[PDB]
Write a protein that binds this ligand. Sequence first.
Ligand SMILES: *[C@@H]1O[C@H](CO)[C@@H](O[C@@H]2O[C@H](CO)[C@@H](O[C@@H]3O[C@H](CO)[C@@H](O)[C@H](O)[C@@H]3O)[C@H](O)[C@H]2NC(C)=O)[C@H](O)[C@H]1NC(C)=O
Ligand SMILES: *[C@@H]1O[C@H](CO)[C@@H](O)[C@H](O)[C@H]1NC(C)=O
Lengths: 78, 51, 98, 46
Amino acid sequence: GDVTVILNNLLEGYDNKLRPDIGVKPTLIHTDMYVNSIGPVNAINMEYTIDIFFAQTWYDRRLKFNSTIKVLRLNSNM
Amino acid sequence: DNTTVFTRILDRLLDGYDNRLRPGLGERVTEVKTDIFVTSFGPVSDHDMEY
Amino acid sequence: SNMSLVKETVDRLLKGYDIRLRPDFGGPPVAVGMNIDIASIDMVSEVNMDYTLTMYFQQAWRDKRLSYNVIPLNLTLDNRVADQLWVPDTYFLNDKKS
Amino acid sequence: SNMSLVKETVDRLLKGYDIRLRPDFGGPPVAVGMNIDIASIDMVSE
Ligand SMILES: *[C@@H]1O[C@H](CO)[C@@H](O[C@@H]2O[C@H](CO)[C@@H](O[C@@H]3O[C@H](CO)[C@@H](O)[C@H](O)[C@@H]3O)[C@H](O)[C@H]2NC(C)=O)[C@H](O)[C@H]1NC(C)=O
Ligand SMILES: *[C@@H]1O[C@H](CO)[C@@H](O)[C@H](O)[C@H]1NC(C)=O
């Protein structure tokens, strides 16, 4: 449909080697954590296990797009 | 800048090469000369009967 | 030269070859013979209720797509060509780690 | 924009770059300097 052409336009001439605003300003990244479990505490090896959902948010203006769609929801594929 | 000469040698060597056929496939036996340098002979496990 | 003819034959075999299709895809089932050379039965654990075995596992079948009548000799190929051929999806049900 | 400069530069630097050959392939040797930052020495097993 139209999501395909949006995704194709977003990734045309897109270099994933360069961070957004690479020579302009630092990239600001907001971080969230959800702790599913703080696992066992091993006192002989000085370590603890923890399972989390790690969330990172930032702005990449190369990925800006004008459409009737407000948010593209994708899996790992991209 | 003599790196382009070596690059051309390298890309000409593999020109037409088929790494699925052993050298001498229809003509002769391929002889492999082998030697070993043991940097360390590890521990022996008599329980697992292995080394 | 002979290697040139072998290379030509292998390229002819593998061009237009669909790995997504078994031999006789729309027809009778393909017969696959199996044989095994057992080299080790290593650990028989009552704690884990399992045993480890090492084997040479050989599967033989026929694929008319991979037939050639120029070269008269059998062809042992570099093992990586297995990635470009169809092989049966054999698995072991009681297998825990392999 | 600096993004266009950086993109053009990075494309030019990787234009026809042979990873098979080291810097100064036939010339003198390349000098590699090493740093190490030890974060932990975990388990000394006898
Ligand atoms: C699970 O098993 C399958 C099949 O036994 C493995 O798939 C094979 O993976 C290898 C390595 O990822 C593939 O080789 C690659 O080929 C490409 C060219 O297509 C080359 O650029 C790479 O350098 C590499 O040589 C191989 O083609 C592929 N074979 C099939 C039939 O899919 C898979 O990797 C196994 N997974 C794990 C986690 O071991
Ligand atoms: C190919 O192998 C089969 C079985 O191993 C054998 O009977 C046949 O003679 C071989 N062909 C040649 C050309 O050696």
